[PDB]
Amino acid sequence: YNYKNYVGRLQSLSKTPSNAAPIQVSLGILATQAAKELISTASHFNFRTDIFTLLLRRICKPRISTDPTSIQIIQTFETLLNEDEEGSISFEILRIFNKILKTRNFNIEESVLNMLLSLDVLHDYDPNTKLKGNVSAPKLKKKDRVHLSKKQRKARKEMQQIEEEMRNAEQAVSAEERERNQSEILKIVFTIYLNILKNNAKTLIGSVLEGLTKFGNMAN
Amino acid sequence: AQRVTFRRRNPYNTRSNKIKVVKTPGGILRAQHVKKLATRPKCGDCGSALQGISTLRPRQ
Numbered sequence: 400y401n402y403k404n405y406v407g408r409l410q411s412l413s414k415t416p417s418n419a420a421p422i423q424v425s426l427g428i429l430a431t432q433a434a435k436e437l438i439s440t441a442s443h444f445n446f447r448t449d450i451f452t453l454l455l456r457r458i459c460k461p462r463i464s465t466d467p468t469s470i471q472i473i474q475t476f477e478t479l480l481n482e483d484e485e486g487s488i489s490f491e492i493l494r495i496f497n498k499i500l501k502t503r504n505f506n507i508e509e510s511v512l513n514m515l516l517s518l519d520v521l522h523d524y525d526p527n528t529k530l531k532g533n534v535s536a537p538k539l540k541k542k543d544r545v546h547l548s549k550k551q552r553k554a555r556k557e558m559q560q561i562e563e564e565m566r567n568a569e570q571a572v573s574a575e576e577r578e579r580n581q582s583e584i585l586k587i588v589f590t591i592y593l594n595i596l597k598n599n600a601k602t603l604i605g606s607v608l609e610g611l612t613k614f615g616n617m618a619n
Numbered sequence: 620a621q622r623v624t625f626r627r628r629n630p631y632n633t634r635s636n637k638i639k640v641v642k643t644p645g646g647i648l649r650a651q652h653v654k655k656l657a658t659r660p661k662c663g664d665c666g667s668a669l670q671g672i673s674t675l676r677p678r679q
């Protein structure tokens with residue numbers, strides 16, 4: 400309840416027509432910074448859609464160069480799209496982005512449109528990529544174990560056998576959902592790019608063609 | 620130099636049947652099946668053998 404009220408207040412304060420007193424503009428800027436900082440970890444929580452909507456509305460303004468936070472919000476959105484592999488948060492952001500663009504007749508800054516270039520869901524890598532060197536003790540040593548009762552050991556076995564099948568099912572569900580999210584995001588991105596091309600905005604052509612070249616081979 | 624074997628139905632080297640060799644009052648070497656040794660009772664919190672409690676089989 401309190402987080403809902405806080406996010407609603409942040410959204411209300413973010414909307415400032417840049418014509419009121421400078422105190423209100425400062426309030427809106429601080430609210431936008433707070434929302435930008437909050438979404439870095441509260442993305443997997445309730446009412447993330449409101450934060451996404453307010454941040455994208457701030458970004459999708461016709462003039463954002465005077466805004467002292469557009470750089471940071473674009474960086475955060477790019478990081479969110481880059482680190483998201485399953486495609487759930489990416490699709491959630493892209494739906495709102497398309498909804499906002501359709502209202503503005505697809506008129507944004509090339510830089511804004513550049514966030515779609517960082518979509519991890521539309522990227523494919525080597526099946527055997529080398530991750531970072533991560534080292535940990537494989538198993539607790541036998542002579543350094545903690546005593547467990549027979550009932551405790553039986554419960555440990557049961558919960559391990561449950562967890563193994565839960566992990567298998569989780570992997571299967573993630574694999575089957577990534578493909579569908581990828582298809583939906585491809586549809587949305589290609590629709591946005593084609594609408595931009597039909598509008599023929601002289602300041603957005605290069606980014607659009609780069610997006611087509613990057614994501615062209617991921618489609619059907 | 621006298622060779623002995625199992626005295627029961629099980630012919631295999633299982634933990635259940637184990638053989639010792641003893642010289643009987645008749646002057647011969649004979650086999651004898653040995654029972655499983657008992658286990659000391661253990662503490663229910665740390666698992667160490669309890670002190671002052673006899674080590675017997677479950678039914679003893």
Ligand SMILES: [Zn+2]
Nearest residue numbers: 662664665666
């Ligand atoms: Zn103890």
